[PDB]
């Protein structure tokens, strides 16, 4: 059910490519790309939460993303996933996006901010769906054959595949300090702030409102946000709180792998001619098609080849 | 197909971290010295080395 994200918030994470070729800390970042399904469907895990907005109410039209120490909402219609051409997103829930993507070498997930700015994260990822059957086809045909395969279903129920969410670490921020003539002033904007200084009064402390510390420089003080009222996924892209894990939350991973049938095409009838102990087959493949043959005696003498163009073979 | 589970790394600054051996299927743990990680808001913590 959608009621799992009640006390969870999205998180900013390091991204190797933010669109301009430079790594940066993005609201959206790719954690894991799962392609266990054999029909090509991709389950992409991102730091965003889709389908649940702020104020903790389910809404399929909105997603929520961390902006600056606090989440904010955006419209889902701006979400895009691409490898080399835009992908068709078949589903979304929380941190997980179910999409279908063309063959490619990278994977970029992005959206539009509330301030009408674009955010995107790009990860190197070799996407190439495995061949189902003996024909390398590009889209399911009108007329053909059915073969077993595995896909990601649309179901968002609990799947006993579980992901841990625990209390996020202290969030450092250099913006919290303003220098005025040797006085470091710490703003709060509504969040508890830890500070530690080696100037003036070297005594570190904790605030909930603005403070000023005299005879100090912005260089020699540290600030962070500590009172975190929501817990986030223990992603490998955020530091841990202590030697042990906080645990304290759990989220089911939706779209379980399920066990279906895929449609594959059947090649055209080849033109067959006969000769003395010889069969001359002229073949018209629309797409790379496997041709194999064997003897039915004691020696199979199996032979195979991928026919890609109109070809005459004598067997 | 296997999946690699990686809990969040432990950044212990102004100190030295350590971990204990576990009995997980293929468990690997290590401590790296002299790291100075940054977050989106800046450096994670003061002590520079």
């Amino acid at each position, epitope marked *: 059910n959608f009621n799992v994200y009640k006390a969870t918030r999205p998180y900013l994470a390091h991204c190797p490519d933010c669109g301009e070729g430079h790594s940066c800390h993005s609201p959206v970042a790719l954690e894991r790309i799962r392609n266990e399904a054999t029909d090509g469907t991709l389950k992409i895990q991102v730091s965003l939460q889709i389908g649940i907005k702020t104020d903790d109410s389910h809404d399929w039209t909105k997603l929520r993303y961390m902006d600056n120490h606090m989440p904010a909402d955006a419209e889902r219609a701006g979400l895009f996933v691409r490898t080399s051409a835009p992908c068709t997103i078949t589903g979304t829930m929380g941190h997980f996006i179910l999409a279908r993507c063309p063959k490619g070498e990278t994977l970029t997930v992005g959206f539009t901010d509330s301030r009408k700015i674009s955010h995107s994260c790009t990860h190197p990822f070799h996407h190439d769906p495995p061949v189902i059957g003996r024909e390398k086809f590009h889209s399911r045909p009108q007329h053909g054959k059915e073969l077993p395969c595995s896909t990601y279903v649309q179901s968002t129920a609990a799947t006993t595949e579980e992901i841990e969410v625990h209390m996020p670490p202290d969030t450092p921020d250099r913006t919290l300090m303003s220098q005025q003539s040797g006085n470091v002033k710490i703003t709060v904007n509504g969040q508890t702030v830890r500070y530690k200084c080696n100037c003036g009064g070297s005594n*570190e402390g904790l605030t909930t409102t603005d403070k000023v510390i005299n005879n100090c420089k912005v260089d020699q003080c540290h600030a962070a946000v500590t009172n975190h009222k929501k817990w986030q996924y223990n992603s490998p892209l955020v530091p841990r709180n202590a030697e042990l894990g906080d645990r304290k939350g759990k989220i089911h991973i939706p779209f379980p792998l399920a066990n279906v049938t895929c449609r594959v095409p059947k090649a055209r009838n080849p033109t067959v001619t006969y000769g003395k102990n010889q069969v001359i087959m002229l073949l018209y493949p629309d797409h790379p098609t496997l041709l194999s043959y064997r003897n039915m005696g004691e020696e199979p003498n199996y032979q195979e080849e991928w026919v890609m163009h109109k070809k005459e073979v004598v067997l | 197909e296997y999946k690699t589970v990686i809990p969040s790394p432990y950044v212990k600054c102004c100190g030295t971290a350590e971990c204990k051996d576990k009995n997980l299927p293929d468990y690997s743990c290590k401590v790296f010295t002299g790291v100075y990680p940054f977050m989106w808001g800046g450096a994670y913590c003061f002590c520079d080395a």
Partner: antibody
Amino acid sequence: QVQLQESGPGLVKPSETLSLTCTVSGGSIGSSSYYWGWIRQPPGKGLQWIGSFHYSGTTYYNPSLKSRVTISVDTSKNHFSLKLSSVTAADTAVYYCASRQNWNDGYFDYWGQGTLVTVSS
Amino acid sequence: DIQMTQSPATLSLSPGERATLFCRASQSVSSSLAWYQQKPGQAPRLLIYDASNRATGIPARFSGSGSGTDFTLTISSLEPEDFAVYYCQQRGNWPPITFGQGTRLDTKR
């Protein structure tokens, strides 16, 4: 959930070292994100704060008493201890050990059974 | 430092009636105020944190409100078990962590 139990001499002399050890039950030091600390209240007065210990390695002390107040933790036998040196008669008060299990702030919501500390006579 | 003053120093009011207590701050602490209960022979007990909501096991009879430098604690009805000495604590700027001097709650006679 978790419980606190204080232990100490109770009666001290002038210039003597006061040591109070609070042992934790139903839990351990290596636990979720929260604080430890010690509180004291003179009879007929409000509560006064001595110090607090955060598991991250930092310690916080009351500036008026920070010069003598030392807070340590023994994770092996699983307690935290407060030491006040050169205790004077003005420090006679009921002491408690405390912690704030939830939300990791400066408040307190768990307690032991505090003991009276008298210094003179 | 920041100092809290409670009002009244002593309050006497009959069981089963609505009660009100005031805590005033020397400096604005937003909502960083906690309302605390203590009984003779008992350790202090937390009732309200951040001047809102309530800790686990604390019923709805206590209601905290206020902001800035002025905060109020409202008791919908005093049952016979609710008579104790109450305190207000600020955490807006600590160390040191500051508590109120205490208000005495009595039953009117």
